[PDB]
Amino acid sequence: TLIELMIVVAIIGILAAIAIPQYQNYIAKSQVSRVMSETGSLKTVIETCILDGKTAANCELGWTNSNLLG
Amino acid sequence: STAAVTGQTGLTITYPASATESAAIQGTFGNSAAIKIKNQTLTWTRTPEGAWSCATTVEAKFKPAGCAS
């Protein structure tokens, strides 16, 4: 009938023209959100090393590799 | 081990030899002490007439009421 088909094509144009919001804010924020937790966990280790008077080599860190180098 | 010579470097004994001079027991922080108070010291002095008193060069907020002089 040629009238239903173009409606489908137009609706395909309607849906497949979806506007993608800038999700990069979420990923960057969450990736930083994890890092502060990782960097913040070493605060007590550094302070305990500081308050005991130990040297840089004498401060043992329980730090392990993470997917982000930060 | 004695007043003249001690077994620890950070502790020195000021032993008087006359009746008109005072005695002092000085203790200097180090090693396991905090980095902020690493180079400070606390001393205990005795006047000839028999009064003991305490003094220290550490920061005021680190000074307890016992040596608040």
From TrEMBL, chain B:
Instruction: Give disulfide pairs as residue numbers.
Output: 54-67
**Coiled coil feature spans:** none
* Family note: Belongs to the N-Me-Phe pilin family.
Q: How does it assemble?
A: The pili are polar flexible filaments of about 5.4 nanometers diameter and 2.5 micrometers average length; they consist of only a single polypeptide chain arranged in a helical configuration of five subunits per turn in the assembled pilus.
**Name of the molecule in the record:** Fimbrial protein
